[PDB]
Symmetry: C3
Subunit: 516 residues, 3 copies
């Protein structure tokens, strides 16, 4: 039994990567350690994907052991699944197009230095393990937390350094790109936020470098996977009789009339092929039509044509703000933007831990049935309001906000930030200033790129980069980003954030006008 | 965004129905409010039922939000699923015969006036929402709680008015019929109980009227669903060679010999058709035989013939009562009636909340396997005993009863009322008087109707109305009814209840004789 | 309703078996009682096994009612599932070869005498019920707990008699054989342990005798089940072209080269038959090859040939011991034996209840994916360490050990006993002496038998008897056995245990050398 260690300094802290001695049956496993906070990360990738499949089964697990802090207790906890998401987000888009083999990443914290948060350490481990595994993965990736103290950027600030920080942000990217950003801020500017992202992305390059060396020394041979064929002949004679007819069908304004022409196009086209050949699995055929359709829309947006509902790239849907909606609640509000709506409440009684945010996403919000996601959205919406909350001494009452997503087709989470803002004011909570959220999208093709404001549910495919921003008129309180494409520069981000600031301000304008 | 409100007085309270502004994606949604207690009720009905299906997927969800009462907590709770049942029961039989599309009703309490119970308010909402939806539904329905104070009926008594009430009953019906009744009473008479049912049914008509007007103004177009064809030709030549042979097979007394003749009939008949045609899906064929069989029995009972086990409409199965069955329990009993049996226990130690009733229904009670319903049955059996419990000052001990349904083929819940009665006496609990329960059935055809005492498990199909009654010799402590047919008048109910009183008394006679 | 009782003295205690009055719908049900501790045990066996099936669905359920002890609470609990295992283990191998009908045994405690443990009483019940049922079952079985006080064996010692006992062991067997043993001991000798097993097996014969009489008087007619045909013609011409080639393929040492020759053999053989006949369900064909293969190995081991990995019957895989592996834990260790590994931890802070053992078995330990068995293994490993723990007054600190099975291919549980030993020493816990565990196997054919040390994961089929032993250099702290074959005498056990003592000592030698 012989371990392979690789050590390096990651600004102020020493990071060690040990592999080859533990869990040798996993596809690859790494014990990442950073100044006494150790997370053992493992990875298993099934060798053969089910027949056809049609869906990449990627699942990350983050477990925190209480013995890791020298304590005896007396799931998974929501916080644990939040960090699992923090790891899943950046690595998920790096798996090649077509890879549908099951992959499970398990991260479990084995030792904890109360000053060094296990999260980025676990992210580092998942990147190392995945890279060493040889599973088709276009990594590695780095991970960094950026703080803001004395108006200067800080690299991986300790838990108490954060007490004097005005920013808590996490960025993860490869060598040439930022993939995901998750943050909470005390009303900073897009420019300051952008600087944290770029700073972090650069500072973490040290990590991607070491992982690379370790892969040279201990890495396994890259799988000889192979994408698995695409019937580019079938979906060639599908586009042959639908492509053009559809690009025209998308020019007719009457919404319900557009579906008709499309449905005709999809009906005629399928029947015509089932007559040429046959036994062609309509399902797959319809699956191809849906694709040239999503591309017809992608081509129209890039060309400057109206979005699917008629809006232009910067248009926000119709707002509607109502306060004091429920009789016996300390504070209620009904914020609705287009087709996504949120009923929000505030209750008081004898910061966070003093501030509680709960999110509910019933199935009827999307006109469906099902059991009665609301976990990651809740944390985002909470970060979006944190900046505005009173100093506890200014308001000695624990406050709890609850959001009911009654409608959804845009971004329930951003909508619940606005409702929370309103409800708290309706409850008499002395919040620093109203706060609002907006969900954006960025579609790109070569150099032609377009920023979208208030993305629809069915505009998700245009989100080569979809991001959320929340704050008041004076600054950004929360910023979340997820990039799945390359290119997209810091300059392009500046543009994107600016258009998002506009949308925010527009929404605040309507909000401030509601609560006179 | 424009809401449609409809307001009306519901005796002492003002009821408001708001629709069209929230959750516009649900098939229909209503915010029902009654003197500050608001429940937002929603409804979603899938447009297309699975292929064939053979089973109506109706599911109701009742959620109570703690913020609704201005409080911060610190599922679903059993009480929440009890009320979900309270809503499901009356609306479930109103969906046309053959409708198998999925339907989900979600009711969530958004504001609570401690004096106005959210339950009837949620029932009202589910009726409004369902009606407005346009889903094939023969409603609406009303809902009312009836109390008994100063020997007079009370409409929707407040929580503290109930402290001076001797009756807590809930009735729900359409315009021409009562569909379900759930109650708890302090030993009243069938006549007084009947008066509460009828009174409530009339008083709630105001509700069905307003819902109707709202449907005129805001209702959606009725679905163009259509029942979906019945092969009345296949199950015509199935009855052609089985109908008569079966009506005779049901005249032979030897139980095990009767099955034989039937099984022969079912075997020969299926084989004969598979020889005429073929590829006829035996399963469906057997599914048709089971139907003319259940009808042969239905025709025999209406004609005055003996039930399937030999009994006459008023006969109760053989009883058997045993006390002090378990060595170390404060109180035990083994009550068995026919083929349904209950092992019941009582434990004491330092009213309800002081009185706890738990129910267990293992799978071997029906000769089956499975995980180890016992929730709605438990509440019923508890109401059945409540009336008899001592005044707490007369007996300063919290008491807990547990019922184990060791056998089942009639009504485990009524059996557990009898066992609880016995066990408590065996434990020395100064109960006012012994109490017993009986599960009845009412089968009707035009004007010819028959009341059945102590219904069997496989007599459930004869229950056009099946109901339960429990009490002592002096009165009724619990009454539960579920009607799925029209006609059945108050006069017919009087008859039914009377035959049930007889059965009760008969059981009490045997019980009182056990515990000398 | 008429019950059939059968009473008899079981040394110091009176055992009563009542059947025929409760749960008459279960295939059979018995109320077993022993000096006031009563457990009602039931059994249901589906009459027809699914089509083909290929897997015996046996499931035991043990429930403990709090009213059984005259108390009001205020799952199943892990302890409850431990006892369910205690019942499942001995009865599971008694179901004839080929029986795949579902069988569920439910045991629920109805009365508890704090002195007489419900467990053996429930075991007795499951044996009685199963026997009476008539389900194909080669029982009955008995059950006995054996204590060790004043250097003499004790039959079913009471809970406080155990306070002065140096042994807590449970044995269950038929008339001619011991099937399962589960124990915890204060460092006794194999000889003393063996004496408890044999003593218990003899003492419990009184039980198997009475159950037999009761079956004569009340038992049901034995099912006319019938094994269900084996295509001994197909797997005759599979062995015809694979048997010999495989027995040779298993002589080549190169591991990866052996698989190759085998895979060729399996490939060629299947293709050749699919050419003779066809539509032969390869799956079933491969299912037959796997069988003559497992038999080729079984024949080689009995003949004295090397095991599949090259080892001889007494060889233990390569060890590796590491201490102080994690930075902030009070005590850590990395014990690895061959391909099974355990990361173990110890945390201190303000015997058992004062001693906590938790076990984790992630799916990557076997190179697989899945949800994140670890319950029965944890209890065993804990018993394995109990003997060594300080007298609480010698060490006033509650200690908690956690084991992470990072690798598995032998016996994670025995490995976690060794790690726990180490970790506790690393934490400074004054344990009496180091302790280790070994998992053995015994393969038998007529009179030729072979004992295997440190069984592999894929050697499980050679375990006609597989057992585990744990202890220090001075004695045995835990002993678990599971026999699925007949013959195997006490003399043969003596041999087996002795070879296991050797393995233990060998492991302790390496361990004591690690922690200098």
């Amino acid at each position: 039994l012989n371990p392979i260690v690789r050590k390096f300094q990651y600004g102020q802290h020493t990071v060690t990567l040990e592999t080859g001695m533990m869990a040798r049956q996993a596809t690859a496993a790494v014990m990442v350690s950073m100044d006494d906070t150790a997370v053992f990360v493992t990875v298993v990738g099934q060798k053969k994907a089910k027949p056809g499949q049609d869906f990449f089964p990627l699942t990350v697990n983050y477990q925190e052991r209480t013995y890791a802090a020298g304590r005896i207790p007396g799931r998974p906890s929501e916080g644990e699944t939040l960090i699992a998401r923090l790891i899943d987000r950046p690595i998920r888009p790096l798996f090649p197009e077509g890879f549908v083999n099951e992959v499970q990443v398990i991260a479990t914290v084995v030792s904890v230095n109360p000053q060094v948060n296990p999260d980025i350490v676990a992210m580092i481990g998942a990147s190392a393990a995945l890279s060493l595994s040889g599973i088709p993965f276009n990594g590695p990736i780095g991970a960094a937390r950026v703080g803001y103290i004395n108006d200067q950027y800080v690299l991986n600030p300790t838990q108490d350094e954060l007490k004097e920080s005005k920013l808590d942000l996490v960025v993860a990217g490869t060598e040439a790109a930022v993939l995901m950003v998750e943050s909470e801020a005390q009303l900073l500017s897009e420019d300051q936020m952008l600087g944290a992202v770029v700073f972090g992305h650069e500072q973490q390059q040290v990590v991607i470098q070491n992982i690379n060396e370790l892969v040279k020394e201990a890495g396994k041979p890259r799988w000889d996977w192979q994408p698995e064929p695409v019937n580019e002949a079938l979906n060639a004679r599908v586009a042959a009789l639908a492509e053009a007819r559809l690009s025209d069908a998308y020019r007719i304004t009457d919404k319900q009339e557009r579906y008709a022409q499309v449905d005709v196009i999809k009906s005629e086209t399928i029947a015509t092929l089932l007559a040429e050949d046959e036994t062609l699995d309509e399902n797959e055929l319809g699956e191809i039509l849906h694709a040239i359709e999503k591309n017809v829309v992608r081509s129209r947006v890039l060309a400057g044509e109206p979005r699917i509902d008629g809006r232009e790239k910067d248009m926000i849907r119709g707002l509607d703000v109502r306060t004091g909606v429920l009789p016996r609640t300390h504070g209620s509000a009904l914020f609705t933007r287009g087709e996504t709506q949120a009923l929000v409440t505030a209750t008081l009684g004898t910061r966070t831990d003093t501030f509680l945010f709960h999110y509910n996403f019933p199935p009827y919000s999307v006109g469906e049935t099902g059991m009665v996601r609301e976990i990651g959205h809740g944390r985002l919406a909470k970060r979006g309001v944190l900046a505005v909350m009173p100093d506890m001494d200014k308001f000695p009452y624990t406050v709890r906000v609850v959001s009911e997503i009654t409608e959804s087709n845009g971004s329930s989470s951003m909508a619940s930030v606005c409702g929370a803002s309103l409800a708290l004011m309706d409850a008499g909570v002395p919040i620093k200033a109203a706060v609002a959220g907006i969900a954006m999208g960025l579609v790109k093709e070569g150099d032609n790129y377009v920023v979208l404001s208030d993305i629809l549910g069915d505009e998700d495919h245009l989100g080569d980069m979809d991001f959320k921003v929340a704050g008041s008129r004076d600054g950004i309180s929360a910023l979340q980003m997820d990039i799945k494409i390359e290119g997209i520069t810091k300059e392009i981000m500046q543009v994107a954030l600016n258009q998002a600031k506009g949308a925010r301000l527009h929404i605040l304008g309507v909000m401030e006008q509601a609560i006179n």
